[PDB]
Amino acid sequence: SDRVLQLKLGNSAIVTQEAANYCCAYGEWPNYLPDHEAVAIDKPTQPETSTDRFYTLRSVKWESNSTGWWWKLPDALNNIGMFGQNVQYHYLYRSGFLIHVQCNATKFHQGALLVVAIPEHQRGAHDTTTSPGFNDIMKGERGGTFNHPYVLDDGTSIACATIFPHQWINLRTNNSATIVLPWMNVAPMDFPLRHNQWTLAVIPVVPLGTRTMSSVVPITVSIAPMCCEFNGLRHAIT
Amino acid sequence: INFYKDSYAASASKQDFSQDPSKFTEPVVEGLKAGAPVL
Amino acid sequence: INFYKDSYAASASKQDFSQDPSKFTEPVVEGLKAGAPVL
Amino acid sequence: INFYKDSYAASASKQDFSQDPSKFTEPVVEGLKAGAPVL
Amino acid sequence: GVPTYLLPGSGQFLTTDDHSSAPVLPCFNPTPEMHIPGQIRNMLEMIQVESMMEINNTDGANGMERLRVDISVQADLDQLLFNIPLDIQLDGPLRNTLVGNISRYYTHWSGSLEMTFMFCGSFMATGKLILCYTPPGGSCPTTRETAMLGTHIVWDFGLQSSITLIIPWISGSHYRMFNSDAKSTNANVGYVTCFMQTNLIVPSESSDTCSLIGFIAAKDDFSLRLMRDSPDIGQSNHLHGAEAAYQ
Amino acid sequence: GVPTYLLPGSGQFLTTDDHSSAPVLPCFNPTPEMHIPGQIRNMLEMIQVESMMEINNTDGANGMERLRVDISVQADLDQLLFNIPLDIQLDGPLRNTLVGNISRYYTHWSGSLEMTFMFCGSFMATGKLILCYTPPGGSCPTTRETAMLGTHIVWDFGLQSSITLIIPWISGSHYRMFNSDAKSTNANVGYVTCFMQTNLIVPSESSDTCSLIGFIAAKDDFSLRLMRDSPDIGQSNHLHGAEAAYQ
Amino acid sequence: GVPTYLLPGSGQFLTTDDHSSAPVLPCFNPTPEMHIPGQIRNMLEMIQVESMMEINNTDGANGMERLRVDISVQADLDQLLFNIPLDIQLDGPLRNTLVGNISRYYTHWSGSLEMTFMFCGSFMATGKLILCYTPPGGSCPTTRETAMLGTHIVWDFGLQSSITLIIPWISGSHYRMFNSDAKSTNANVGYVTCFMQTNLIVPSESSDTCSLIGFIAAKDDFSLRLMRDSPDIGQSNHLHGAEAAYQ
Amino acid sequence: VESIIKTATDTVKSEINAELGVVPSLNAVETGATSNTEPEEAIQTRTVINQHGVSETLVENFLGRAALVSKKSFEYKNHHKNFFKWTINTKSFVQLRRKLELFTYLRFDAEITILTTVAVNGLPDLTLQAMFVPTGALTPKEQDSFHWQSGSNASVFFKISDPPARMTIPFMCINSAYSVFYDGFAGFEKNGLYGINPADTIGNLCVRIVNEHQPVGFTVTVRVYMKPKHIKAWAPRPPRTMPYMSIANANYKGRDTAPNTLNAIIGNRASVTTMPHNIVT
Numbered sequence A: 001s002d003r004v005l006q007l008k009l010g011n012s013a014i015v016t017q018e019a020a021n022y023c024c025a026y027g028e029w030p031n032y033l034p035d036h037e038a039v040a041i042d043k044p045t046q047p048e049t050s051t052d053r054f055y056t057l058r059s060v061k062w063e064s065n066s067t068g069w070w071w072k073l074p075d076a077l078n079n080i081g082m083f084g085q086n087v088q089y090h091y092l093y094r095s096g097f098l099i100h101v102q103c104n105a106t107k108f109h110q111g112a113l114l115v116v117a118i119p120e121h122q123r124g125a126h127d128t129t130t131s132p133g134f135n136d137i138m139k140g141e142r143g144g145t146f147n148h149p150y151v152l153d154d155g156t157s158i159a160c161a162t163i164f165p166h167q168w169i170n171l172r173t174n175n176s177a178t179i180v181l182p183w184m185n186v187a188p189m190d191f192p193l194r195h196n197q198w199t200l201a202v203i204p205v206v207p208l209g210t211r212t213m214s215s216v217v218p219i220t221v222s223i224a225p226m227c228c229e230f231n232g233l234r235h236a237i238t
Numbered sequence B, C, D: 001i002n003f004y005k006d007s008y009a010a011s012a013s014k015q016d017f018s019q020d021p022s023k024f025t026e027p028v029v030e031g032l033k034a035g036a037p038v039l
Numbered sequence E, F, G: 001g002v003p004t005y006l007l008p009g010s011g012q013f014l015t016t017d018d019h020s021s022a023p024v025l026p027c028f029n030p031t032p033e034m035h036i037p038g039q040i041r042n043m044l045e046m047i048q049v050e051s052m053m054e055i056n057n058t059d060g061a062n063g064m065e066r067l068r069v070d071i072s073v074q075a076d077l078d079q080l081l082f083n084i085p086l087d088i089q090l091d092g093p094l095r096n097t098l099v100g101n102i103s104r105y106y107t108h109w110s111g112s113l114e115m116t117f118m119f120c121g122s123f124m125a126t127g128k129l130i131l132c133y134t135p136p137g138g139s140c141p142t143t144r145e146t147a148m149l150g151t152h153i154v155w156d157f158g159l160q161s162s163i164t165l166i167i168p169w170i171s172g173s174h175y176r177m178f179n180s181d182a183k184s185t186n187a188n189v190g191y192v193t194c195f196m197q198t199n200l201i202v203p204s205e206s207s208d209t210c211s212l213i214g215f216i217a218a219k220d221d222f223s224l225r226l227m228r229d230s231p232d233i234g235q236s237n238h239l240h241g242a243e244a245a246y247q
Numbered sequence H: 001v002e003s004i005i006k007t008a009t010d011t012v013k014s015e016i017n018a019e020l021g022v023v024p025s026l027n028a029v030e031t032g033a034t035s036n037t038e039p040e041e042a043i044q045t046r047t048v049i050n051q052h053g054v055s056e057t058l059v060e061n062f063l064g065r066a067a068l069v070s071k072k073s074f075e076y077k078n079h080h081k082n083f084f085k086w087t088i089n090t091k092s093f094v095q096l097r098r099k100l101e102l103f104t105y106l107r108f109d110a111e112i113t114i115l116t117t118v119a120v121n122g123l124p125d126l127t128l129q130a131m132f133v134p135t136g137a138l139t140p141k142e143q144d145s146f147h148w149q150s151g152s153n154a155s156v157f158f159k160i161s162d163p164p165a166r167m168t169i170p171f172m173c174i175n176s177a178y179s180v181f182y183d184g185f186a187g188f189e190k191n192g193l194y195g196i197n198p199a200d201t202i203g204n205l206c207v208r209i210v211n212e213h214q215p216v217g218f219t220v221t222v223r224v225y226m227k228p229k230h231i232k233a234w235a236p237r238p239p240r241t242m243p244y245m246s247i248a249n250a251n252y253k254g255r256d257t258a259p260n261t262l263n264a265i266i267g268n269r270a271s272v273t274t275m276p277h278n279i280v281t
């Protein structure tokens, strides 16, 4: 009953027959900006189905020595579909996100991935006093990789990362993780090209292993923006 | 008693005993029943 | 509370929120209607 | 009057005049009557 | 007596404190109040009055020439006429205005601004212009096709001599800051540009170069916070006569 | 005036005092509050979230390898697999956890703890383990026959991947202290040990070595007292850029 | 603000003052109270318990031998057996008792005292004694005919092993003082003497020398005033380990 | 789900359990939820009326302490020439920094206490001036420049012989809360600083000795303490483990040897079956 799930948004839908319930970050659900919290006075555009739908990113391969992967939001989607177009033509944006991470193998494989949504995941650089640069942070649709997952690449720890909204993909138990993210920021809206509200991290705490036939085991990420709103229309910063 | 005209000047407010651990401990859409199998 | 006998010794009076910008922004004898041509 | 928020900060409490010397002077199970032979 | 104890801060002199203090002249009777025209109670009342922007802040323009923008009959189409830096913290066309001067005594601001332009050519001169406000994020537009995508007003010269371009408050945060870094995400307001929509057209006896005067003011949805000393005034020596006050 | 007298303590600066003090910016209007997800009001809310124990804190285990305990198919019976020092004040597997980190900002604690273990082997792998909590007093048990006499849970691997061992609050005194003497009667919590109840059994194509991830968290009957500075952070020099803040 | 002025005494630290003071640990929750046997609320409760008088404070008597008075079968009549100095301020048989020790933390006292003696000879031993309290004014009586004129109790040995001599509060002034001058009219309490009323008589197989143990306590009409440091304890050097507390 | 909690929860007595279909001790960590197994379901418990308080862990108390945020020594003599400027930040001292960083967002007013001490190179009872220079305002260039006239800036004048100066700075962010962490860049171009939200820019604290120099020199040290109050906090975070390296970022290196080394946070024990402080009787 809580192992099967279908998510439908816009012209897109996803089903899983091996889910583990699903997480609603901090027990919240996405919503449009109410009049009593609004700041920007221009009438916003709410494109609905053209932007609030699942966008599937390129997959990554789970290898025996993988350290983990990460994708920042909205950066990862800032150049995809109509969500990307609205982001480029508008100074301000606001939205929640429905995240669905996918990874299947066989009943002979073992492995466990921590799938966590980190708010304001400010990265640190290793063994230097120089702060991370633009290209170290903005990876776009391709996402990045963890250098030292043990400390979440920020001098803290993955051990305590469970304090953030998360799920796990334990091959023996499930083949997907689902997390619903509400707007998370100190402002009602923001400029999408210079700030990322959330960072999706997928880290193999227990490495992939088996003694059966070796096969490429991918990890795929599908993300659907929710309740998108845009303000401050102008030309595209394409 | 705050004798200053600006409320932000007042002493600390140590009376908010409200809590909701579940937003961190049980952020799952479907409530998990006591002894019933979670999956 | 002013403990001095002269009222001018009291603390500041920051409670006058009355305004009338129009004495500076619209000092015209004939009120100008919203969208109607001013001239 | 204690102006601090923590009650343990208050001045001394010198108003407890209750006593029960018998817990030290007569801890015997059977009460001993005035002039009656104790044994 | 009453048992007391002094707290940290005791004896200090905070320039923004607010307490009563000993009257120097007991029983003094101040002059009766009399009604006087023009009372102002909130500085926001002052910044709602439009004042002239120094748009032509260029070498070669002296004094009042800096307060008007001259437009000429064009030979080409869709021509860019001028742009206006929306810098208030950094020096620029908006700095020496009522809204600019008063706002600079503060650090945070929020609210809509309004720019009004009055065409001062002759009656026989006609034309259409397009004024555009471009929210931040990119480079200032240099072509009408690009500027036209932002907030704008197409202005037709005629009996009503002036047009108003509203620069609506469009910001992610509640307030913006008058930060020394003009390119900061918490300070940059965007741009204002002006192009010919058609062209300035005049007969032989009308001057072929006409001036515009641009004004700016805050709307009543404006608000300022965090008072600070203004960078617009300073001194390095005693003013003449200051020392003589002691002689 | 009012006759008064200063008490001892007058003029002192106690870092934990609680008084009102002069507002630096009179009439300042703070930004309106907005709802933000995840508000936390009591630190006890944070320590109720389970986090990973670094059980494999051994030489040769690097980074994340230290966060999982590998169990293999055994050749002998009733084998001891691992034990967990319940040290919170002294460094150990429980120190870098949410409950451990926050508790170390305090000196006294009381309440039940819960350890949850998730089996991360393949679906075809089966097994039964016994997790035991031994109240203090003696030496850590090294045989199942001895450990089995304490509080325990026999765990059968299956659809439900995880098991919880409750470490109930069993103490003579209301609270225990995070004392530097690990063998003190007011600090030692006892031990946690894990033995094979049966054995880890897997088919030829499933990996024959599987990992467990152990988590720990406080229950809602938990309480912390006497705030102190945490021993988990310190500095011996200025951080890079600290002095530059003055230039 | 409020006009005030500091009074003499301002800023002083009086060890007996009573004021509230800043809590070091805000929001600290003390351990819940639990019922514990033997709560004492007034020191007067303690001094009402009788304790042993060191009547045999003589050279040759060591340790516990000093706490009992041996009486023997007499050859002569009306023999004086022993007397007890009623000195509390000056060292004497009453000093190291519950009433004596606690009273010495004070300067003034008032109330009745009670001395109880328990005969510890064998069952076959018989006898009659007379215990006398002589109010102050003269020299301690040395003959029964003289002592007998004061307050007294004739004691017959038997089933009930103990007798009580009440030393009623008989004083001109409301209180007496623990003054260093033992012969002062505001301090001297008088004397207590004990004589054979008949004789100690025992059979051949019973010991012919028997012991008495004397106890003393205050009655509930007792009262103490003016707290002072006790002369019963002092130090001239650091105690062992005191300085090490700083290492 | 939300409720008022003033004491730790009580325990209820429990009996023997042998029910099919009911397995309270089994859970599924994969859901992301923490185990909901109660003590009463794991073992047989007795009834306990728990009176233990939970007020010392209130966020207001946890963060409500005056902590050192700035310390600056300078020479007071005939010439930092008798004054200094400090770009305000809460990242220079690690005890306060680590605690604030346990949260993602924080909204609070800040009580500021300024403590001054002096040493001869008797002690003069000097008068100092601490002026708050907001963003965009001009900072003093000399001990005597016109800037100190402080016509609009808030300034506080205090003596070394008086108790430490104190005042409260209101929550002054342009947003609804301060961003303790910021995964973004401060500008519209690509060369801006990463991890520094412009919105949380306070300004500069300028401090000078008002007195003209004396015939001899002195060393003056100014310590500034900050205590947050009227606190609201959101989204707790993993505590810092690696030593801090810079005030401008979360860069890390780790200690040279455990504990808290990049390769091992917890110190090593001989093996997973080795009990470190085992009781030997």
Ligand SMILES: CCCCCCCCCC(=O)O
Residues within 6 Å of the ligand: H069, H088, H089, H090, H100, H106, H110, H112, H169, H178, H179, H180, H181, H200, H202, H226
């Ligand atoms: C000493 C003035 C402090 C003003 C408030 C600073 C808040 C900083 C919050 C943070 O980003 O960690």
